[PDB]
Design a protein around this ligand. Structure first.
Ligand SMILES: CC(C)CCC[C@@H](C)[C@H]1CC[C@H]2[C@@H]3CC=C4C[C@@H](OC(=O)CCC(=O)O)CC[C@]4(C)[C@H]3CC[C@]12C
Ligand SMILES: *[C@@H]1O[C@H](CO)[C@@H](O[C@@H]2O[C@H](CO)[C@@H](O)[C@H](O)[C@H]2NC(C)=O)[C@H](O)[C@H]1NC(C)=O
Ligand SMILES: CC[C@H]1C[C@@H]2C[C@H]3c4[nH]c5ccc(OC)cc5c4CCN(C2)[C@@H]13
Lengths: 537, 118, 110
C-alpha cells in the first residue's frame, strides 16, 4: 500500500483541506448577523467541545485499521457497513455544488488580465441603467432597483438570471462555464492519475500560497486610516443576541462545516501510516490554525467595507445582506475599482479561491477513491487508472444540473440542505457506534501505545457525552425552524422546499437499507442476528 | 425632456477644423453613453464613436478614427467633437445621439435638431 | 464588422395591408437573451424616431402597429395595416460592440 513520506507534506494536505471557500462565506456573512463580536465567543467555546472530538474521531478511527472507509466497519461493527456508501452519495451532491463555484473564480481570472477592468464603467453590454455606484460630489440616488457594477458583474454577467424566472423553468447552456469545468477536473486528474506520492511533491507549495494573500491584502487596507474607522464600529459589543438563541445552534454547525469530519477524507489520509507520537500534534495545530484562519479570513473582508462605508455613510448591515455568496464577489470587486492599485491584486486575488478550490477537490477526492479501491482488488491491481477516470466522468454529469439550467437556484438550495441533516445524520451514527456499542475502554488500550500516554481525562468525557449532545441540537432545531431561503428577491415555492428536504433525507437511506439485507439473509433467532451482526456484543 | 441643442453650421475648407457642440440635459447625462451619426442626401446612416462624460472612453471604426476626436466635460454638461482635415465628402449633417440602457436593448431614444456641415 | 442587408428594396404597402421587413446578418448576435437589433423611423428632414425596443417590445410614443419577433439570423418586422403618415425609411440597428453597423434600407411606400 502507498505511503506519504515527509511529515509536513502530510499535515499541509489537512491544512489546505480544512480551509474552504465555505469558511470565506458562511463565517463572515453569519458573524455580523449574530452580533458580530458576540459570534466569536460561541465560536471558541463550541470549537473546543464541539470541534475537537468529531475532528480527531475520523483521524483516530482511520489510524487504527488502515483498510479504507467501507471495510473499516467490517471489524468493529459490521452492522454499520452502510456509512461508506452514505459518504459517497452525499459527496456527489456537494461536488456539483463545489465545482460550479470554481468556474466563477476561473472565469474572472481570464478577465483580470486586462489593465482597464470592466468595473469602473458599465459598458454597452450590461444593465447599465441601474449602475449607480459612483461616489461623486453628492450625486447618489438610492432606489429600490439601484445596483452596483459589481452586482451586475455577478447578477447578470455570469449568472444571466434574468432569463430563468425560477425552478419551474430552465435557461440556456452557457459554454463559458462549460469550458471552466474542463480545467477544474483537468488539474485534479493529473495529480491523482499518477499516484499518491505525487501529492508529496506538488501541493506542498500550494498550502503556503493563500496565507500570504491575507497578509498582503490586509496591509493594503491599512494604508488609509479611513478603513480603520469602519472595523471599530463593526466589532462593537452586541450582547443582546446571546440570550435569544436564534441560530446560535447554527454557530456550532459552522465549526462542523469548517473542519468537516466524517467524510472519510482524514481516514484515507491516516490509512497509509501509523503516525506514532505525532498524530495528536497534527490535530491540535489544525484546530487552532482554523480558529485563526476563519477569524483572519473575515477580518480582512470587512476591512474593505470600512473604506466603502466612509463615502457611503451607511451601516454595514444594509450592505451585502441579500445572499452569502454575493458578498465576496461584490465586496472585493468594488475595492480594486476605487483603489489605484489595479492590475496587480486582481490576478493575485482570484488565484486564492482557485488554489483552495484545487486543494479540497483533490484532498477530498482521496477519501472516496481510497474506499472502493481497497475492497476491489481486481480493480486496484490493473484497472486502477481506468476506474478512477470513470468516477470523474460521473462528476461533471451532475454539475450540468446547475450550469445547463442557467440559474443559481441549485446553489442556494444546496447550501443548507446538502450539508444539513444529510452529513449530520451520517456523522452522528459514526460517533454513537464507536463509543456505545464498540467498547471505548478497549479502544484506548492500543491507541495509548501509539500516543505514548493514556488518552483519559480528555477523551473519556467528550466522545461519550459531548459528542452526541451538540449533534442533537442541530437536527431537532432544523426541523422545528425551516430556514426559508431567498435569492435575489425571490421566495421559493413551498413544494420546492420539499425537494431539498427529501434529497437530503433520501441521501442516507442506504444506511437503514443494507442493514435489512444483512440481517434477513442471516438465519437463526432474533438475538443471534444481533450477535452475528455486531461481533463485539 | 429633449434638450440636445447643437451649435450652428460651419464652412468646410480643405484642412479645416470644426468644433461641434451639444447640450447634455433633460436626463442623467453622467450615466449614459453619447454617440454621433452621419447622414447625407441619398445615403443612409453610419455610426461614428462613443464617449462618456466623466471617463472619456472612446471606440472608433468605419475609417473615422483617422481624424475623430471626442471630448466631454461632466461639469459643463456638454459633449464636443473635433474633426480636423475635412474634405468635400465630409459635408453632411450630424445628430447628437444618445443610446438607452441595457434594460431595453440600448436603443437611441433622444436626438438633436442637427447641424449642417456645409 | 457585422454585415447587414435588407430586402425587398422598395415595398408598395397599400392601405389596409400588413408589411414584412427583415434584417439578415452573418452573426450570431444573440447574447444575454436580448438580440441587439432595433428599428428607427427616418422621414425627410426629421431625425430618427425609435419604433421597437430590442425588436420585440413596443415602445412609448409610437403607435401599436409595429411589432417584431423571430429567432436566429432572420427576423421580420410585422406591422399592422399601415397609415399614410407612417411613410418612412427604416434601418436595422446593431449595438454589439466594438464596431457598429446599420442596414442598407428599404423604402416603404404605397
Ligand atoms: C497561521 C499559521 C501558523 C498556521 C498554518 C501553519 C503553516 C505555516 C504551515 C506551513 C509552514 C509550516 C511549518 C513550517 C515550520 C515548521 C517547523 C518544523 O520543525 C521541525 O521539523 C520539528 C517539528 C516538531 O518538533 O514536531 C516543524 C513543522 C513547521 C512548524 C511547519 C508546520 C506547519 C506549518 C506551520
Ligand atoms: C433595474 O432593475 C430591473 C432590471 O431587471 C428593472 O426593474 C424594472 O422595474 C419596474 C418598476 O418597479 C418593474 O416593472 C420591473 O421590475 C422592471 N421593469 C422593466 C421594464 O425593466 C429596471 O428596468 C432596471 N433599470 C432601471 C433603470 O431601473
Ligand atoms: C473540510 C470541510 C468539509 C465539510 C463540507 C463537506 C466537505 C466536502 N465533501 C466533499 C466531497 C468531494 C469533494 O471533491 C471531490 C469535496 C468535498 C468537500 C469540500 C467542502 N467541505 C464542506 C468539506
Amino acid at each position: 500500500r502507498e505511503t506519504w513520506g515527509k511529515k509536513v507534506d502530510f499535515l499541509l494536505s489537512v491544512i489546505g483541506y480544512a480551509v474552504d471557500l465555505g469558511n470565506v462565506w458562511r463565517f463572515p456573512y453569519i458573524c455580523y448577523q449574530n452580533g458580530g463580536g458576540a459570534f466569536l465567543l460561541p465560536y471558541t467555546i463550541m470549537a473546543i467541545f464541539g470541534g475537537i472530538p468529531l475532528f480527531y474521531m475520523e483521524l483516530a478511527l482511520g489510524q487504527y485499521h488502515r483498510n479504507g472507509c467501507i471495510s473499516i466497519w467490517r471489524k468493529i461493527c459490521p452492522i454499520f457497513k452502510g456509512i461508506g456508501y452514505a459518504i459517497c452519495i452525499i459527496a456527489f451532491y456537494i461536488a456539483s455544488y463545489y465545482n460550479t463555484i470554481m468556474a466563477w473564480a476561473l472565469y474572472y481570472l481570464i478577465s483580470s488580465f486586462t489593465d482597464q477592468l470592466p468595473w469602473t464603467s458599465c459598458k454597452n453590454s450590461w444593465n447599465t441603467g441601474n449602475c449607480t455606484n459612483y461616489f461623486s460630489e453628492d450625486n447618489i440616488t438610492w432606489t429600490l432597483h439601484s445596483t452596483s457594477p459589481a452586482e451586475e458583474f455577478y447578477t447578470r454577467h455570469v449568472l444571466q438570471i434574468h432569463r430563468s424566472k425560477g425552478l419551474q423553468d430552465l435557461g440556456g447552456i452557457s459554454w463559458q462555464l462549460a469550458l471552466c469545468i474542463m480545467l477544474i477536473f483537468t488539474v485534479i486528474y493529473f495529480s491523482i492519475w499518477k499516484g499518491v506520492k505525487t501529492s508529496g511533491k506538488v501541493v506542498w507549495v500550494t498550502a503556503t500560497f493563500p496565507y500570504i494573500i491575507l497578509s498582503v491584502l490586509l496591509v493594503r487596507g491599512a494604508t488609509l486610516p479611513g478603513a480603520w474607522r469602519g472595523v471599530l464600529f463593526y466589532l462593537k459589543p452586541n450582547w443582546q443576541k446571546l440570550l435569544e438563541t436564534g441560530v446560535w445552534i447554527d454557530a456550532a454547525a459552522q465549526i462542523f462545516f469548517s473542519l468537516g469530519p466524517g467524510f472519510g477524507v482524514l481516514l484515507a489520509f491516516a490509512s497509509y501510516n501509523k503516525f506514532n507520537n505525532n498524530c495528536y500534534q497534527d490535530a491540535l495545530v489544525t484546530s487552532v490554525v482554523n480558529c485563526m484562519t476563519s477569524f483572519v479570513s473575515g477580518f480582512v473582508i470587512f476591512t474593505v467595507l470600512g473604506y466603502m462605508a466612509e463615502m457611503r455613510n451607511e451601516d454595514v448591515s444594509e450592505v451585502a445582506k441579500d445572499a452569502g455568496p454575493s458578498l465576496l464577489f461584490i465586496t472585493y470587486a468594488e475595492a480594486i475599482a476605487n483603489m489605484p492599485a489595479s492590475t496587480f491584486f486582481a490576478i493575485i486575488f482570484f488565484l486564492m479561491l482557485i488554489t483552495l478550490g484545487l486543494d479540497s477537490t483533490f484532498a477530498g477526492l482521496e477519501g472516496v477513491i481510497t474506499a472502493v479501491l481497497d475492497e476491489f482488488p481486481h480493480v486496484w491491481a490493473k484497472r486502477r487508472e481506468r476506474f478512477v477516470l470513470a468516477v470523474v466522468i460521473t462528476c461533471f454529469f451532475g454539475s450540468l444540473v446547475t450550469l445547463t439550467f442557467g440559474g443559481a437556484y441549485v446553489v442556494k438550495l444546496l447550501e443548507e440542505y446538502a450539508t444539513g441533516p444529510a452529513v449530520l445524520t451520517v456523522a452522528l451514527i459514526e460517533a454513537v457506534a464507536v463509543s456505545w456499542f464498540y467498547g471505548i475502554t478497549q479502544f484506548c488500550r492500543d491507541v495509548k501505545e501509539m500516543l505514548g500516554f493514556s488518552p483519559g481525562w480528555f477523551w473519556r468525557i467528550c466522545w461519550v457525552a459531548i459528542s452526541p449532545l451538540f449533534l442533537l441540537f442541530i437536527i431537532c432545531s432544523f426541523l422545528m425552524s425551516p430556514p426559508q431561503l431567498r435569492l435575489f428577491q425571490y421566495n421559493y415555492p413551498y413544494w420546492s422546499i420539499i425537494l431539498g428536504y427529501c434529497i437530503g433525507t433520501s441521501s442516507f437511506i442506504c444506511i437503514p437499507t443494507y442493514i435489512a439485507y444483512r440481517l434477513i439473509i442471516t438465519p437463526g433467532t432474533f438475538k443471534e442476528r444481533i450477535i452475528k451482526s455486531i461481533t463485539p456484543e | 425632456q429633449v434638450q440636445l441643442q447643437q451649435s450652428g453650421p460651419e464652412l468646410v475648407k480643405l484642412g479645416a477644423s470644426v468644433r461641434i457642440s451639444c447640450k447634455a440635459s433633460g436626463y442623467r447625462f453622467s450615466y449614459s453613453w453619447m454617440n454621433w451619426v452621419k447622414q447625407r442626401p441619398g445615403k443612409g446612416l453610419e455610426w461614428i464613436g462613443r464617449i462618456y462624460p466623466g471617463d472619456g472612453d472612446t471606440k472608433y471604426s468605419g475609417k473615422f478614427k483617422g481624424k475623430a476626436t471626442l471630448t466631454a466635460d461632466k461639469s459643463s454638461s456638454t459633449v464636443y467633437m473635433q474633426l480636423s482635415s475635412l474634405t468635400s465628402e465630409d459635408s453632411a449633417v450630424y445628430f447628437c445621439a444618445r443610446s438607452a440602457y441595457g434594460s431595453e436593448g440600448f436603443a437611441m431614444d433622444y436626438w438633436g435638431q442637427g447641424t449642417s456641415v456645409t | 464588422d457585422i454585415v447587414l442587408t435588407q430586402s425587398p428594396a422598395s415595398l408598395a404597402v397599400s392601405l389596409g395591408q400588413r408589411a414584412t421587413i427583415s434584417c439578415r446578418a452573418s452573426e450570431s448576435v444573440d447574447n444575454y437573451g436580448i438580440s441587439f437589433l432595433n428599428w428607427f423611423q427616418q422621414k425627410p428632414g426629421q431625425p430618427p424616431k425609435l419604433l421597437i425596443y430590442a425588436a420585440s417590445n413596443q415602445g412609448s410614443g409610437v403607435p401599436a402597429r409595429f411589432s417584431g419577433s423571430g429567432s436566429g439570423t432572420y427576423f421580420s418586422l410585422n406591422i399592422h395595416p399601415m397609415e399614410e403618415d407612417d411613410t418612412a425609411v427604416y434601418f436595422c440597428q446593431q449595438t454589439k460592440g466594438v464596431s457598429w453597423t446599420f442596414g442598407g434600407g428599404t423604402k416603404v411606400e404605397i
